[PDB]
Amino acid sequence: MKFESSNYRGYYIRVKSFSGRIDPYVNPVEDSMFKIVPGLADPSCISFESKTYPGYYLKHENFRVILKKYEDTDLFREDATFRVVPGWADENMISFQSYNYPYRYIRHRDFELYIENIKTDLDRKDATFIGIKV
Amino acid sequence: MKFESSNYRGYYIRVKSFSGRIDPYVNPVEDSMFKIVPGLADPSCISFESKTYPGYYLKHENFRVILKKYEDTDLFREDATFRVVPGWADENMISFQSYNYPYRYIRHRDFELYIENIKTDLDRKDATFIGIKV
Amino acid sequence: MKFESSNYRGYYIRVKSFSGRIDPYVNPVEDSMFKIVPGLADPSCISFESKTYPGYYLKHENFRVILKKYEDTDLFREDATFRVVPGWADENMISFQSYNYPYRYIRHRDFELYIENIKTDLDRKDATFIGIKV
Amino acid sequence: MKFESSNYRGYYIRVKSFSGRIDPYVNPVEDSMFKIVPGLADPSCISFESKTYPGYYLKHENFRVILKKYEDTDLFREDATFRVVPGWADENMISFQSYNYPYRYIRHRDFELYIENIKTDLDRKDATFIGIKV
Amino acid sequence: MKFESSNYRGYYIRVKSFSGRIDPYVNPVEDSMFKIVPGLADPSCISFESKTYPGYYLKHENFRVILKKYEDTDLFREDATFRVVPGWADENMISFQSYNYPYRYIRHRDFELYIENIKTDLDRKDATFIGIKV
Amino acid sequence: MKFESSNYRGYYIRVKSFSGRIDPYVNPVEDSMFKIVPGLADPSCISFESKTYPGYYLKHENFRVILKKYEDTDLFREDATFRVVPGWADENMISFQSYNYPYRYIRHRDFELYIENIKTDLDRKDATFIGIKV
Numbered sequence: 152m153k154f155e156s157s158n159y160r161g162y163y164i165r166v167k168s169f170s171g172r173i174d175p176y177v178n179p180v181e182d183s184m185f186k187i188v189p190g191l192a193d194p195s196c197i198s199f200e201s202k203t204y205p206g207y208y209l210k211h212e213n214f215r216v217i218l219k220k221y222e223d224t225d226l227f228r229e230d231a232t233f234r235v236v237p238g239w240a241d242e243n244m245i246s247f248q249s250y251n252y253p254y255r256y257i258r259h260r261d262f263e264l265y266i267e268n269i270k271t272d273l274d275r276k277d278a279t280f281i282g283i284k285v
Numbered sequence: 286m287k288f289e290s291s292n293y294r295g296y297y298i299r300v301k302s303f304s305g306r307i308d309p310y311v312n313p314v315e316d317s318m319f320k321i322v323p324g325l326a327d328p329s330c331i332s333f334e335s336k337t338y339p340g341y342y343l344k345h346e347n348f349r350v351i352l353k354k355y356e357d358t359d360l361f362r363e364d365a366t367f368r369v370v371p372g373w374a375d376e377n378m379i380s381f382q383s384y385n386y387p388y389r390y391i392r393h394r395d396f397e398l399y400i401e402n403i404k405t406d407l408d409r410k411d412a413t414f415i416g417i418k419v
Numbered sequence: 420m421k422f423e424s425s426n427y428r429g430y431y432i433r434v435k436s437f438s439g440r441i442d443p444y445v446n447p448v449e450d451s452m453f454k455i456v457p458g459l460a461d462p463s464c465i466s467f468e469s470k471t472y473p474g475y476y477l478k479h480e481n482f483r484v485i486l487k488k489y490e491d492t493d494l495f496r497e498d499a500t501f502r503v504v505p506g507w508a509d510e511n512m513i514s515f516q517s518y519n520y521p522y523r524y525i526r527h528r529d530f531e532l533y534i535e536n537i538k539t540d541l542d543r544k545d546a547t548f549i550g551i552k553v
Numbered sequence: 554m555k556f557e558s559s560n561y562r563g564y565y566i567r568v569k570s571f572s573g574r575i576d577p578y579v580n581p582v583e584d585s586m587f588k589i590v591p592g593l594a595d596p597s598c599i600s601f602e603s604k605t606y607p608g609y610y611l612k613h614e615n616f617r618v619i620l621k622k623y624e625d626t627d628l629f630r631e632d633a634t635f636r637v638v639p640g641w642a643d644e645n646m647i648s649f650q651s652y653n654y655p656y657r658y659i660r661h662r663d664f665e666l667y668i669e670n671i672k673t674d675l676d677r678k679d680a681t682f683i684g685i686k687v
Numbered sequence: 688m689k690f691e692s693s694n695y696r697g698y699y700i701r702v703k704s705f706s707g708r709i710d711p712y713v714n715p716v717e718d719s720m721f722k723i724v725p726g727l728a729d730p731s732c733i734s735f736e737s738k739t740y741p742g743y744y745l746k747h748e749n750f751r752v753i754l755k756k757y758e759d760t761d762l763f764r765e766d767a768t769f770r771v772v773p774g775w776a777d778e779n780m781i782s783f784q785s786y787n788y789p790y791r792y793i794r795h796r797d798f799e800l801y802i803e804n805i806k807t808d809l810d811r812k813d814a815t816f817i818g819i820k821v
Numbered sequence: 822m823k824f825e826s827s828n829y830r831g832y833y834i835r836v837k838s839f840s841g842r843i844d845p846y847v848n849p850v851e852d853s854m855f856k857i858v859p860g861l862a863d864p865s866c867i868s869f870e871s872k873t874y875p876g877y878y879l880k881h882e883n884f885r886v887i888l889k890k891y892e893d894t895d896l897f898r899e900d901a902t903f904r905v906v907p908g909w910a911d912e913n914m915i916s917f918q919s920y921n922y923p924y925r926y927i928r929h930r931d932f933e934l935y936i937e938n939i940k941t942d943l944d945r946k947d948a949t950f951i952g953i954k955v
């Protein structure tokens with residue numbers, strides 16, 4: 152899957168230099184592709200496995216979303232697990248709730264990805280994405 | 286209404302993940318159904334309202350044709366307004382002229398929809414559709 | 420939510436002067452109201468956040484249940500995390516197992532709240548409550 | 554591997570007199586067993602090789618699914634290649650998309666196997682199978 | 688809950704490829720875990736909901752016990768409803784009476800699960816299970 | 822008699838869903854009580870009869886210690902007979918030697934009971950108990 156920003160249409164979640172961001176015209180395009188697997192800490196949730204680096208996962212660290220090779224620890228698995236919920240800014244879209252910080256959601260901010268509290272209308276838009284099957 | 290491609294018969298304009306494309310055997314079939322209303326920026330034109338998502342309209346953005354929730358601005362309304370003209374490759378069919386970019390028409394290219402300049406014979410066929418009432 | 424004692428109907432869990440007890444005719448009634456949040460030490464458990472004082476949680480300290488402002492330590496979060504299990508004195512009601520003392524449960528005694536081992540029939544009634552949504 | 558019909562539980566894909574069908578209580582049971590090999594026309598897909606007759610493959614011909622001895626042609630290899638997709642009638646089961654007819658899927662009809670367009674709810678169930686390792 | 692066979696101790700009811708059976712050393716072990724809910728056709732009975740596949744239930748079909756996604760029909764709900772009774776071979780254990788075939792009980796036979804009439808001492812043991820809370 | 826673990830004091834051998842384990846605060850307490858009778862296969866040894874379930878005995882099966890209704894076979898009696906010996910980790914306490922597997926002793930492991938070889942210092946403690954008359 153790829154994931155498009157709802158308020159920056161044409162921009163996709165991607166990994167660059169092992170950090171998460173959103174970008175248009177993602178090059179290489181595989182940087183925006185993920186294998187969605189049952190959540191490492193909770194199978195009702197999801198984890199994002201990198202397509203170009205198998206065994207690496209999106210995960211938060213100091214509340215920034217980075218890409219990191221799997222580590223056999225509860226904290227890594229919990230940092231790498233996200234619950235898909237109806238989109239904050241549009242219930243027909245999606246948002247990603249952090250498993251171990253349930254009041255923080257994946258959002259972009261100056262085009263970089265964080266997990267942060269969602270309080271304003273701009274926060275909600277920044278936290279709302281479109282899932283695309285490739 | 287559904288809209289069938291004239292050079293890919295059996296392929297229909299449809300929304301997938303809030304983006305416009307043409308596909309055959311559209312699943313679910315409602316993805317290819319639209320409520321045609323008077324153009325949001327000009328009643329002599331038309332706008333394509335989603336049957337699945339009322340209040341969402343086909344609209345161009347970065348010249349890509351996408352589905353987006355109605356916004357109360359002139360630019361959104363214009364981006365969502367299209368003039369039905371006689372088909373570029375066949376006057377018995379129709380083409381869709383963009384209200385705010387009059388030299389650009391809805392066309393498919395690698396099965397995704399854009400508003401682009403119609404120059405060659407392939408361009409004309411890619412921009413020529415058949416309107417089917419349902 | 421509010422929580423009514425099973426063996427003292429009309430007595431609800433409440434905070435008074437930042438310590439936990441059960442009282443009837445709770446004045447002000449907001450003292451008996453809690454926001455049930457994901458468990459601070461484990462999201463599959465619960466914590467009781469004060470409605471009157473956001474950011475304050477019921478938690479045990481020297482095995483007394485008190486209300487205390489959040490502190491960013493593992494011990495505080497574990498002291499503030501409880502597992503909802505079927506009621507000791509009635510399986511259709513509920514009891515609250517301590518996260519870090521798994522054989523101690525919230526119970527009243529002289530109308531004050533403790534986490535204690537649950538041994539007698541009176542112990543079980545003292546540890547059994549009725550959840551009431553508000 | 555054997556493949557059980559999702560709507561006719563206990564009915565398995567089997568070869569009878571070199572023709573594909575679904576049957577209960579398959580005798581000999583080897584007629585329902587296949588070696589899943591890299592797709593003859595595309596190693597990222599699959600082909601079904603006969604366990605009873607090595608070098609024979611399930612392949613479609615005039616849209617009927619039959620068992621045929623390998624032939625060294627592009628058409629044969631394409632007729633014998635299928636893509637495993639999430640099941641039409643259940644995402645946790647599987648369906649088999651034809652490699653050279655990408656909008657046709659293996660389905661049973663009067664207990665015989667075809668590749669056909671999948672339009673109705675009955676079509677989707679007829680096209681949905683349960684893989685069973687042996 | 689999981690459910691252990693009384694005459695094959697260490698063998699548990701589990702789902703494998705959407706069919707019920709008993710197996711030792713169940714892998715993955717969640718295949719043997721169920722959420723016990725009020726009977727879909729009668730609240731005084733029980734239904735077994737899959738932990739692995741939420742919204743899927745154990746239900747009999749041609750008297751075989753299978754796993755199937757919930758369907759909004761009386762027949763499905765009745766096929767998925769079972770009454771817990773004292774065990775046929777041991778009153779301290781349990782058996783499962785079919786709601787709509789009241790003389791048929793869940794039993795294993797060649798390690799596969801059916802609902803069948805219980806007549807012999809072997810039948811009774813085959814229909815007697817141990818409930819284990821997990 | 823009850824039998825307390827030497828390395829987990831306050832934890833007692835008990836039967837839960839007809840399987841052997843050690844638990845503190847055993848509930849109901851009769852789950853930890855046994856009638857010590859002369860060994861079923863050798864009256865100079867002992868067998869543990871259930872107080873809750875007269876005629877049921879602790880016995881090993883697949884080297885797991887379980888509770889099972891008496892069976893009139895030599896193998897059952899052999900599986901249910903144990904010899905009290907000086908404790909592996911404390912000669913003032915006791916251990917239980919399997920009668921038909923004389924190098925295997927009752928030990929707890931992840932709080933469940935097995936008959937296993939006693940090799941390490943952890944093994945010896947896991948195999949050492951305090952008998953308490955009731």
Ligand SMILES: OC[C@@H]1O[C@@H](O[C@@H]2[C@@H](O)[C@H](O[C@@H]3CO[C@@H](O)[C@H](O)[C@H]3O)OC[C@H]2O)[C@H](O)[C@H]1O
Nearest residue numbers: 210211212213214215226227229230251252266
């Ligand atoms: O994303 C939120 C949590 O952050 C990680 O845990 C952090 C941990 O990374 C942090 O380490 C800091 C990093 O900066 C150094 O200069 C400092 O010395 C060091 O202590 O400590 C706080 C802790 O919360 C988790 O992966 C994630 O859950």
Ligand SMILES: OC[C@@H]1O[C@@H](O[C@@H]2[C@@H](O)[C@H](O[C@@H]3CO[C@@H](O)[C@H](O)[C@H]3O)OC[C@H]2O)[C@H](O)[C@H]1O
Nearest residue numbers: 158159173258259260261262263273274276277
């Ligand atoms: O991720 C894209 C958008 O980025 C955020 O909005 C930014 C906003 O953060 C930025 O403000 C800058 C921040 O740095 C300050 O020093 C500066 O003064 C200020 O102008 O302005 C641009 C805007 O795009 C949104 O969260 C997100 O949508």
Ligand SMILES: OC[C@@H]1O[C@@H](O[C@@H]2[C@@H](O)[C@H](O[C@@H]3CO[C@@H](O)[C@H](O)[C@H]3O)OC[C@H]2O)[C@H](O)[C@H]1O
Nearest residue numbers: 344345346347348349360361363364385386400
């Ligand atoms: O489909 C044609 C027109 O495209 C949209 O307008 C675009 C607009 O999206 C674009 O915004 C850019 C975003 O990136 C910034 O760096 C830049 O400064 C900003 O201008 O601007 C170009 C414009 O063509 C309209 O919806 C649609 O009419």
Ligand SMILES: OC[C@@H]1O[C@@H](O[C@@H]2[C@@H](O)[C@H](O[C@@H]3CO[C@@H](O)[C@H](O)[C@H]3O)OC[C@H]2O)[C@H](O)[C@H]1O
Nearest residue numbers: 292293307392393394395396397407408410411
């Ligand atoms: O929308 C369906 C048809 O797509 C266009 O024609 C395409 C054509 O674009 C494609 O050429 C490929 C495109 O990707 C490039 O990267 C590559 O270099 C080029 O070879 O060939 C297939 C054909 O389907 C038409 O506009 C439209 O009819």
Ligand SMILES: OC[C@@H]1O[C@@H](O[C@@H]2[C@@H](O)[C@H](O[C@@H]3CO[C@@H](O)[C@H](O)[C@H]3O)OC[C@H]2O)[C@H](O)[C@H]1O
Nearest residue numbers: 478479480481482483494495497498519520534
């Ligand atoms: O409710 C059970 C546990 O009680 C608290 O832990 C206590 C801890 O508060 C106590 O600390 C004392 C504080 O005063 C100092 O002078 C003294 O040296 C120090 O030991 O020690 C006992 C311990 O049980 C926890 O919050 C809670 O888990």
Ligand SMILES: OC[C@@H]1O[C@@H](O[C@@H]2[C@@H](O)[C@H](O[C@@H]3CO[C@@H](O)[C@H](O)[C@H]3O)OC[C@H]2O)[C@H](O)[C@H]1O
Nearest residue numbers: 426427441526527528529530531541542544545
């Ligand atoms: O929380 C309400 C109830 O309080 C406890 O029961 C109390 C009990 O503790 C109390 O016992 C006193 C102890 O002091 C002695 O001097 C006196 O004689 C004795 O009566 O008596 C009142 C009774 O309500 C329960 O745990 C709980 O239900």
Ligand SMILES: OC[C@@H]1O[C@@H](O[C@@H]2[C@@H](O)[C@H](O[C@@H]3CO[C@@H](O)[C@H](O)[C@H]3O)OC[C@H]2O)[C@H](O)[C@H]1O
Nearest residue numbers: 612613614615616617628629631632653654668
């Ligand atoms: O299953 C779908 C396609 O069916 C086969 O292709 C058939 C082909 O076999 C058929 O050939 C006939 C054979 O007899 C000749 O006398 C006659 O001239 C010729 O037409 O023609 C139709 C075609 O669809 C493929 O194996 C398979 O892809």
Ligand SMILES: OC[C@@H]1O[C@@H](O[C@@H]2[C@@H](O)[C@H](O[C@@H]3CO[C@@H](O)[C@H](O)[C@H]3O)OC[C@H]2O)[C@H](O)[C@H]1O
Nearest residue numbers: 560561575660661662663664665675676678679
């Ligand atoms: O492969 C098993 C099932 O077969 C199809 O459903 C059949 C259906 O085809 C059949 O209908 C017949 C059609 O012929 C008429 O003459 C007759 O009146 C009518 O009954 O009835 C049996 C039914 O099972 C499905 O595709 C497939 O599930």
Ligand SMILES: OC[C@@H]1O[C@@H](O[C@@H]2[C@@H](O)[C@H](O[C@@H]3CO[C@@H](O)[C@H](O)[C@H]3O)OC[C@H]2O)[C@H](O)[C@H]1O
Nearest residue numbers: 746747748749750751762763765766787788802
């Ligand atoms: O487990 C007992 C019952 O089995 C299911 O109902 C069965 C049904 O599956 C079976 O279907 C056949 C399919 O072929 C058709 O030709 C025929 O008409 C039809 O009867 O029929 C018997 C019936 O008992 C129920 O889910 C369950 O109660």
Ligand SMILES: OC[C@@H]1O[C@@H](O[C@@H]2[C@@H](O)[C@H](O[C@@H]3CO[C@@H](O)[C@H](O)[C@H]3O)OC[C@H]2O)[C@H](O)[C@H]1O
Nearest residue numbers: 694695709794795796797798799809810812813
């Ligand atoms: O589920 C485990 C046990 O299985 C049944 O007992 C079996 C018995 O059914 C089996 O007899 C075989 C069955 O398969 C036929 O092919 C064959 O004809 C017949 O001899 O023999 C093994 C025995 O354990 C019990 O109901 C159940 O306890």
Ligand SMILES: OC[C@@H]1O[C@@H](O[C@@H]2[C@@H](O)[C@H](O[C@@H]3CO[C@@H](O)[C@H](O)[C@H]3O)OC[C@H]2O)[C@H](O)[C@H]1O
Nearest residue numbers: 880881882883884885896897899900921922936
């Ligand atoms: O606790 C140790 C010994 O275990 C019991 O006997 C076991 C026996 O139950 C087991 O036999 C099964 C028979 O069914 C087959 O399908 C299976 O392959 C086989 O493992 O095998 C081990 C044997 O020792 C005794 O009661 C006890 O002494």
Ligand SMILES: OC[C@@H]1O[C@@H](O[C@@H]2[C@@H](O)[C@H](O[C@@H]3CO[C@@H](O)[C@H](O)[C@H]3O)OC[C@H]2O)[C@H](O)[C@H]1O
Nearest residue numbers: 828829843928929930931932933943944946947
């Ligand atoms: O019966 C209670 C005790 O259980 C056994 O020891 C357990 C041990 O089996 C369990 O395994 C873990 C696995 O993860 C590793 O990282 C960890 O170090 C390892 O110990 O851990 C808990 C421990 O209590 C003993 O036989 C028995 O005393």
Ligand SMILES: [Cl-]
Nearest residue numbers: 152153284285
């Ligand atoms: Cl994808």
Ligand SMILES: [Cl-]
Nearest residue numbers: 286319320419
């Ligand atoms: Cl219409």
Ligand SMILES: [Cl-]
Nearest residue numbers: 404405406407
């Ligand atoms: Cl041209």
Ligand SMILES: [Cl-]
Nearest residue numbers: 420421552553
């Ligand atoms: Cl509430």
